[PDB]
Design an enzyme around this catalytic site. Sequence first.
Site, mmCIF file in Angstrom:
data_model
loop_
_atom_site.group_PDB
_atom_site.id
_atom_site.type_symbol
_atom_site.label_atom_id
_atom_site.label_comp_id
_atom_site.label_asym_id
_atom_site.label_seq_id
_atom_site.Cartn_x
_atom_site.Cartn_y
_atom_site.Cartn_z
ATOM 1 N N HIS A 60 24.916 68.822 36.622
ATOM 2 C CA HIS A 60 24.448 68.203 37.855
ATOM 3 C C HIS A 60 23.377 67.169 37.574
ATOM 4 O O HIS A 60 23.473 66.027 38.033
ATOM 5 C CB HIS A 60 23.922 69.280 38.796
ATOM 6 C CG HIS A 60 22.921 68.789 39.787
ATOM 7 N ND1 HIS A 60 23.247 67.929 40.807
ATOM 8 C CD2 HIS A 60 21.601 69.044 39.919
ATOM 9 C CE1 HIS A 60 22.171 67.673 41.525
ATOM 10 N NE2 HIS A 60 21.158 68.337 41.007
ATOM 11 N N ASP A 80 27.685 33.598 34.552
ATOM 12 C CA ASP A 80 27.927 34.969 34.140
ATOM 13 C C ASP A 80 26.665 35.437 33.430
ATOM 14 O O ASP A 80 25.667 34.722 33.379
ATOM 15 C CB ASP A 80 29.177 35.053 33.260
ATOM 16 C CG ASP A 80 29.711 36.455 33.135
ATOM 17 O OD1 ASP A 80 30.701 36.756 33.807
ATOM 18 O OD2 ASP A 80 29.125 37.254 32.370
ATOM 19 N N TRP A 140 18.393 69.748 31.578
ATOM 20 C CA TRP A 140 18.698 68.390 31.169
ATOM 21 C C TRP A 140 17.723 67.895 30.123
ATOM 22 O O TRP A 140 18.046 66.965 29.384
ATOM 23 C CB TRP A 140 18.714 67.456 32.373
ATOM 24 C CG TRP A 140 17.387 67.057 32.867
ATOM 25 C CD1 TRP A 140 16.503 67.830 33.529
ATOM 26 C CD2 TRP A 140 16.798 65.764 32.769
ATOM 27 N NE1 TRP A 140 15.383 67.111 33.835
ATOM 28 C CE2 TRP A 140 15.544 65.834 33.378
ATOM 29 C CE3 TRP A 140 17.206 64.555 32.212
ATOM 30 C CZ2 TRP A 140 14.694 64.745 33.452
ATOM 31 C CZ3 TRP A 140 16.361 63.478 32.284
ATOM 32 C CH2 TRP A 140 15.121 63.578 32.898
ATOM 33 N N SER A 146 24.966 52.243 26.322
ATOM 34 C CA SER A 146 25.274 51.399 27.475
ATOM 35 C C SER A 146 24.020 50.824 28.111
ATOM 36 O O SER A 146 23.938 49.618 28.362
ATOM 37 C CB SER A 146 26.041 52.196 28.509
ATOM 38 O OG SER A 146 25.216 53.187 29.059
ATOM 39 N N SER A 147 23.032 51.669 28.371
ATOM 40 C CA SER A 147 21.831 51.205 29.046
ATOM 41 C C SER A 147 20.885 50.440 28.138
ATOM 42 O O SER A 147 19.920 49.860 28.637
ATOM 43 C CB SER A 147 21.100 52.385 29.670
ATOM 44 O OG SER A 147 21.912 53.011 30.641
ATOM 45 N N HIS A 180 9.356 59.886 31.363
ATOM 46 C CA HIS A 180 8.742 59.254 32.530
ATOM 47 C C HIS A 180 9.151 57.786 32.712
ATOM 48 O O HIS A 180 9.359 57.374 33.871
ATOM 49 C CB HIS A 180 7.217 59.365 32.580
ATOM 50 C CG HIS A 180 6.677 58.922 33.898
ATOM 51 N ND1 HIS A 180 6.603 59.765 34.981
ATOM 52 C CD2 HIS A 180 6.327 57.698 34.352
ATOM 53 C CE1 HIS A 180 6.166 59.092 36.028
ATOM 54 N NE2 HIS A 180 6.009 57.829 35.679
ATOM 55 N N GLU A 188 12.036 56.761 32.169
ATOM 56 C CA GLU A 188 13.350 56.921 32.776
ATOM 57 C C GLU A 188 13.254 57.062 34.286
ATOM 58 O O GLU A 188 14.033 56.451 35.025
ATOM 59 C CB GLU A 188 14.047 58.133 32.175
ATOM 60 C CG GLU A 188 15.343 58.492 32.840
ATOM 61 C CD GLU A 188 16.295 57.330 32.892
ATOM 62 O OE1 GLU A 188 16.577 56.747 31.828
ATOM 63 O OE2 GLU A 188 16.759 56.994 33.997
ATOM 64 N N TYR A 218 10.857 55.970 36.193
ATOM 65 C CA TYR A 218 10.470 54.714 36.837
ATOM 66 C C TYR A 218 11.584 53.678 36.778
ATOM 67 O O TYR A 218 11.673 52.812 37.663
ATOM 68 C CB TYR A 218 9.178 54.198 36.225
ATOM 69 C CG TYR A 218 8.047 55.031 36.720
ATOM 70 C CD1 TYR A 218 7.654 54.942 38.027
ATOM 71 C CD2 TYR A 218 7.427 55.956 35.909
ATOM 72 C CE1 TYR A 218 6.659 55.707 38.510
ATOM 73 C CE2 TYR A 218 6.416 56.760 36.384
ATOM 74 C CZ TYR A 218 6.041 56.607 37.695
ATOM 75 O OH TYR A 218 5.055 57.355 38.248
ATOM 76 N N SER A 223 12.845 45.905 49.247
ATOM 77 C CA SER A 223 12.122 44.689 49.592
ATOM 78 C C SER A 223 13.051 43.595 50.085
ATOM 79 O O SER A 223 12.614 42.702 50.814
ATOM 80 C CB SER A 223 11.324 44.199 48.400
ATOM 81 O OG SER A 223 10.314 45.120 48.068
ATOM 82 N N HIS A 233 2.119 64.335 31.593
ATOM 83 C CA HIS A 233 1.918 65.127 32.786
ATOM 84 C C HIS A 233 3.037 66.120 32.990
ATOM 85 O O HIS A 233 2.949 66.961 33.885
ATOM 86 C CB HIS A 233 1.728 64.239 34.017
ATOM 87 C CG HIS A 233 2.863 63.315 34.329
ATOM 88 N ND1 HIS A 233 2.678 61.963 34.473
ATOM 89 C CD2 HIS A 233 4.167 63.539 34.599
ATOM 90 C CE1 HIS A 233 3.823 61.391 34.787
ATOM 91 N NE2 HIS A 233 4.743 62.326 34.875
ATOM 92 N N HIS A 234 4.080 66.037 32.187
ATOM 93 C CA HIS A 234 5.083 67.074 32.113
ATOM 94 C C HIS A 234 4.735 68.120 31.074
ATOM 95 O O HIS A 234 5.509 69.057 30.877
ATOM 96 C CB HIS A 234 6.443 66.466 31.793
ATOM 97 C CG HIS A 234 6.752 65.228 32.568
ATOM 98 N ND1 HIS A 234 7.250 65.257 33.849
ATOM 99 C CD2 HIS A 234 6.655 63.924 32.237
ATOM 100 C CE1 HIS A 234 7.436 64.024 34.278
ATOM 101 N NE2 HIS A 234 7.088 63.196 33.316
ATOM 102 N N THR A 283 1.945 51.584 43.743
ATOM 103 C CA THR A 283 2.928 52.080 44.696
ATOM 104 C C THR A 283 2.383 52.075 46.112
ATOM 105 O O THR A 283 3.122 51.791 47.063
ATOM 106 C CB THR A 283 3.359 53.483 44.322
ATOM 107 O OG1 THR A 283 2.204 54.318 44.278
ATOM 108 C CG2 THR A 283 4.010 53.497 42.977
ATOM 109 N N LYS A 318 2.667 48.514 47.252
ATOM 110 C CA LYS A 318 4.037 48.213 47.648
ATOM 111 C C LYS A 318 4.371 48.787 49.014
ATOM 112 O O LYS A 318 4.994 48.117 49.842
ATOM 113 C CB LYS A 318 5.003 48.744 46.606
ATOM 114 C CG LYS A 318 4.918 48.016 45.301
ATOM 115 C CD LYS A 318 6.123 48.267 44.450
ATOM 116 C CE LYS A 318 7.289 47.481 44.953
ATOM 117 N NZ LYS A 318 6.967 46.046 44.981
ATOM 118 N N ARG A 369 11.780 77.877 38.433
ATOM 119 C CA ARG A 369 12.940 77.012 38.301
ATOM 120 C C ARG A 369 14.025 77.666 37.471
ATOM 121 O O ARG A 369 13.794 78.640 36.753
ATOM 122 C CB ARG A 369 12.572 75.699 37.631
ATOM 123 C CG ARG A 369 11.965 74.694 38.530
ATOM 124 C CD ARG A 369 11.509 73.483 37.760
ATOM 125 N NE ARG A 369 12.615 72.643 37.347
ATOM 126 C CZ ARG A 369 12.462 71.492 36.717
ATOM 127 N NH1 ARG A 369 11.254 71.059 36.425
ATOM 128 N NH2 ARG A 369 13.521 70.785 36.375
#
Lengths: 236, 45, 51, 102, 99, 269, 534, 59, 75
Positions: free
Chosen positions: G62, G92, G127, G157-158, G241, G243, G245, G256, G290-291, G316, G319, G438
């Site tokens: 998931h 292109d 994960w 890919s990314s 982290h 990832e 963001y 926006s 922070h994790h 943030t 924004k 969890r």
Amino acid sequence: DVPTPYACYFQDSATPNQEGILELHDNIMFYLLVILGLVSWMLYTIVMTYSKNPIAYKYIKHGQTIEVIWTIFPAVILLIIAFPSFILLYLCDEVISPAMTIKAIGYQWYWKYEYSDFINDSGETVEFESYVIPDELLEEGQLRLLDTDTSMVVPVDTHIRFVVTAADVIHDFAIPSLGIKVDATPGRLNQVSALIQREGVFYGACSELCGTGHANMPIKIEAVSLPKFLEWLNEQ
Amino acid sequence: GRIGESWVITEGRRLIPEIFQWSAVLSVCLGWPGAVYFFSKARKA
Amino acid sequence: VHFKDGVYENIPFKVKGRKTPYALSHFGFFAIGFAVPFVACYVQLKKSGAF
Amino acid sequence: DEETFEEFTARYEKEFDEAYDLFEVQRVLNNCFSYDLVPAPAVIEKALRAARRVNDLPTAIRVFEALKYKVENEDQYKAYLDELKDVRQELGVPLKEELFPS
Amino acid sequence: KFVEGLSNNKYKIITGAWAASLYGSWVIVNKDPIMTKAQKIVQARMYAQFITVGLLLASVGLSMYENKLHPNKQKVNEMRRWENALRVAEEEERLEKEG
Amino acid sequence: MTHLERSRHQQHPFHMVMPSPWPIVVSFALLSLALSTALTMHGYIGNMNMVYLALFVLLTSSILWFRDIVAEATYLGDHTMAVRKGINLGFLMFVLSEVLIFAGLFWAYFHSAMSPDVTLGACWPPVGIEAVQPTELPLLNTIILLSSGATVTYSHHALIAGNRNKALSGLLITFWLIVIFVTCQYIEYTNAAFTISDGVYGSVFYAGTGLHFLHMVMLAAMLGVNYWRMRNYHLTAGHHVGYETTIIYTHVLDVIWLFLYVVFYWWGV
Amino acid sequence: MVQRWLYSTNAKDIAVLYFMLAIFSGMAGTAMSLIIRLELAAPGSQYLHGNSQLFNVLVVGHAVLMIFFLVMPALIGGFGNYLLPLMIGATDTAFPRINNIAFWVLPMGLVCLVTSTLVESGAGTGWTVYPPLSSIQAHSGPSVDLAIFALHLTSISSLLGAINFIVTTLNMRTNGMTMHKLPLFVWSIFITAFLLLLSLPVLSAGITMLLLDRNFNTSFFEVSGGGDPILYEHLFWFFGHPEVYILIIPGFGIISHVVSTYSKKPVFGEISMVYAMASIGLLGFLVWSHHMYIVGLDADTRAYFTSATMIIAIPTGIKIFSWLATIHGGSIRLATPMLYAIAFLFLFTMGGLTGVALANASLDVAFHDTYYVVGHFHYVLSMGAIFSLFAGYYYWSPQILGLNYNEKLAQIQFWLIFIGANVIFFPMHFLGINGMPRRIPDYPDAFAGWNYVASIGSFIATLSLFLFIYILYDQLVNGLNNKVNNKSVIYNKAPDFVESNTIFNLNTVKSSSIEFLLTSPPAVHSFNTPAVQS
Amino acid sequence: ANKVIQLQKIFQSSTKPLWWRHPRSALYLYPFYAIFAVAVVTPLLYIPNAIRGIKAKKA
Amino acid sequence: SPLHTVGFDARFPQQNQTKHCWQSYVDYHKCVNMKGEDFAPCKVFWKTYNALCPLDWIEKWDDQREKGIFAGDIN
Ligand code: HEA
Ligand code: HEA
Ligand code: CUA
Ligand SMILES: [Ca+2]
Ligand SMILES: [Cu+2]
Ligand SMILES: [Mg+2]
């Protein structure tokens, strides 16, 4: 001390750490509710008075005298919520003159406790493994997925130091009403402190994914007075 | 000059009902689990 | 390569002129995706003797 | 813009005087009512004469609908309707409320 | 005298000297511009690491200049650490016997 | 030129690439490589013939892709100035990604070495491990890399200066020095006391310098294809961008080998 | 037909292949979440006959499917590859064969993830595949290897798409477009591609280290041998982290655009929005521990990390206050992208405020590995990024497809997912603050009360997803008739108050980007001559 | 031996796809499709034994 | 109260205490070569390592010192 059905708040505190954690959480939630009320009120009033506005003020782009204000004001509210957080952070780390050490070793799907101070008349180290009572052998009245066959018994009004490690994978020694959460990794020894302020029994669970028995891995701490702790330790 | 009705009246009679509407929408948007707890058996009713 | 322009030529799949209904292709494209974890569940429960 | 109100009126009077078709008078009227001020009576008068020059009647009605939406009160609207009455009856445009009475 | 005092700042001075040699040779290679910036970078860097490897073999030259001072370290202040960790167990044993 | 004839060209400097099969072919080769190694690692496939076939297909498909790139750049004239700038920027972002891979590996070495374990003995290099001394063969390996850069620099600037023999010979010397370095690393790996299974030391050491070894064997390959294209007159005096990327690649492998040298061989012994 | 779609080299085709794969894998991940949430509905074994390994494998599938196979190939892969060349005026992307292999390595990651599920027991590890659980002692077999290869092919890919994006917007901008005059979505994809380029290497290093630990007897994270799994936590979360963001910054760009075109006034302080996005991207590399507040760091480590995790609430906040300022004083046209954008502006701020509750390491000892954290991140994921993804679909779908959707069905779908997601993810804070951990398939009986209402809300969410599938079917079949009848909004901007209905007809679209000026479904050769800008 | 103009005149004046325009392309392209066709479908044949749990014969 | 425990030590006052039990173990076992038997403060090291270091590690390290595989210096 135990979760209740449909609860929405913390469990009832038993250590000064958890009672400080509750106050810091409420102090943060104060300003958080201020900011939530502000942005939800703006988001309500804007779409309820400008959905029916047929002329858009399309020349408002800069706002110099107030961009600095909504940059500065979040920073001072961060400072206000960060002032007690640092005090709690630098208060909860000191483990100064404890009267008891207890080691807690997480194996795969049992915990193993070890009182190691030789304050006994036996003079030997006390260890035992505490397994979950399985669902078919629960005698009537017992709390499912929380009760164990053996228990960790601790005296009250005593600075206790929990030294936490593991044996094979990463576990987590976690009791929320005592407010201790500490990762048991198989290489190192962490420590936390507690001072139990009231007698009772407090439940917790492994809060780190250990595998297929991860839900079946609870912690049960009976805090008693010091005579009853001594007479418990005299056997095991 | 300040022609017409006062601005405190002009904007109070607009902002007063939207305060109450915001209160209703916020309490149904946040306090909707209270409506489940009220009818749950854990309340013993 | 010069490719065809238009409304339905930007998609890899055929929608308008078909001998089969399009809802076949459309809903069987998504039911397979909704049904991969059920095939997963079936084989990992048959491997564990629950079936 | 660090514009005073008087520079606004003197900018938009000569801006309405230089519109030459229906696209331009509607455009200039749009971006003069898209500010945080009700326009002065003089620039509304210049807008009415500009819509007269291009010969479009519903824009000279939408001028008054726009300042009805734009003023804060209904007595500010009636103050505009008092001393804009002579130019309105001279051009002969009707207000929308008396044209489509509810 | 000064020799170990900045010979334990040994691999923190030579990387600074590398950064000094590249970012200093950069202005001498960039003051005469007809090459593209990449060729200036690769030639300034080519000079600079000849400098750092020459200074690094001067580093091992200093390393055996310097420990004819006291022989057989990597243990003779594990001697220090263990010797006073020892009799700081002594300072506790006594006034818990007499306290 | 007239409007009628200007209309028979592209109006913008960018390469509109023709449709090509090698993206999906390399993708299926990576699939076959992953599915072959994950089953030969666990014994569901008898021998390594599937992994060998998959790596061979992957390599030849990459070679056909590079052949088409060479064909576009040389025989169709599709690489204008903007396309050259874009290719150089893409290669620079690529080498930044690989420098960051090496930064992760250096983080692994430093996290094991800044304060080591108790199972090695609060020691670095660990007890019993006979470390590679930085004076004998790795000093020659630094020398034949700092010299390989000096060879490829004059080979490049003589390619610009109109010389043919002085550029081909410098490229040949660069390629042979790179394979001297690779065979010296093979000799060190054979005559090394510790292996990759000998604890976290052998892990981090062989991880860092073996990734550098793999980058150097690809560097020898691209120096070879640059020699081929310079001998067969593909490379010109003003338009040599694959050569320029190889020069950038040499000069970043040089500095990351220096960081590997001073960290893995001087500070960590 | 094989050369246009298998041998593809134009970005607008690779974008719709990305979109088809993304919505397929999102159906897969939503089915997996329905199974998770159906098992979690009541205490005891309910649907999976015991078998907590299968539960853990489904949680892994998931998370990995919804992150790496729906949100990234949807947002970055579809919307960036489609719109960034069209919004910078590029013909292109630069490097188009790279752009094609960056799609075609995703079905191969999908098939190796699915056979990772089908081999011996699957990889039930979370994960964040932590050793020593993810090792060879605790996970024997090819499950975790194939999951690691799925992560490798998605990272390939990314990374290739990130290089492609960086070069094509630094190099192929049209001939009036300086970097300050870029649209905000292009700045989103730009900053996202830098975060990808700087963060995916350390992840690839860490999980290749794990793979060598599993199969090649090496010891990076093996304790009996000298390892440390905290090294894996550092090397993972230095990607982890950035990832998250990466997951949210194109959502900020989509919001926006949508908010400005449905408020009919430009964004309040655009360059400060660019600065805020760049500051979030820069500061996201400084907050990764922070994790790791529980693992046993120092006090000064945790003090710095609370400070640095706290000071990302400033850009943030800039924004979100700018979004409120650019809807203040507007003429709001309540269409479906506007509904999704307002729901973003509320629910993302609620998730961010629980995020600043979690930022205090003093307090995160009460909330780590609880369902409170699950509430925070499922707010800012399935109500931030999914709501901006739905907003982007309903905002760009009739332009880039040529077919309008049913507007009433779209608003029904919005209100159903807005109700259902709240009903799933709002009681998770109650469970987490009462101590529910969890990754458990079964819980104590005192947690049943909010778990039941959460899995009731799960059915509302998947019912709105099924409604979205029907909306896609009705758009593909009856999309030419939805323009004729009044089932759809044809113009996303109404006339201004003095603009005639005939003066509107010569200037039907009033946009600040090229995407809505093109021909519907856009041409295979858009921009033969280059677009020009003052 | 400087065939580059002679090869430009072939690659530009051609109808075939770009990977087919060289005269020697039939020597590369026909073996590669066979090697590729076995290389992509032979692990897919071992996928069912890996699902069932049957390891290959080594002793 | 008869309850007495290891106090905090200025060398290791943070959360991780692996090199508390390992250092006190290696300090105890490198007493009894240089110090010998029946020495009164090497039970300070003994209480420190056996109060906070786990039994698996203690018996592993004692097995390793009988191997010759112990990674400390106690000879
Ligand atoms: C992309 C992020 C994402 C999204 C959208 C979701 C969506 C949902 N998730 Fe989850 N979840 C995670 C990321 C996400 N999740 C992660 C990272 C974990 C951690 C795993 C771990 O602990 O290791 C997790 C774990 C997790 C848990 C904790 C369980 C555990 O700890 O083991 C739960 C609880 O029930 C849960 C349930 C759900 C439910 C009911 C939804 C529902 O919201 C589904 C409803 C959503 C939709 C219907 C979205 C629309 C669908 C689309 C396909 C969009 C299509 C639109 C276009 C293509 C334009 N998931
Ligand atoms: C969509 C991606 C996304 C985004 C945008 C965020 C945003 C934030 N997150 Fe979150 N987070 C995750 C995805 C995300 N997160 C995931 C996936 C996990 C779990 C991983 C796992 O364990 O599996 C996680 C878990 C996570 C943790 C780890 C806790 C734990 O695991 O124990 C922390 C710790 O600090 C954190 C904090 C924050 C903060 C401070 C923000 C901030 O960026 C939020 C900023 C927004 C606001 C603050 C609100 C708007 C601002 C204002 C209205 C101004 C006024 C407000 C103030 C001044 C406070 N989140
Ligand atoms: Cu032990 Cu989870
Ligand atoms: Ca259950
Ligand atoms: Cu984070
Ligand atoms: Mg954890």
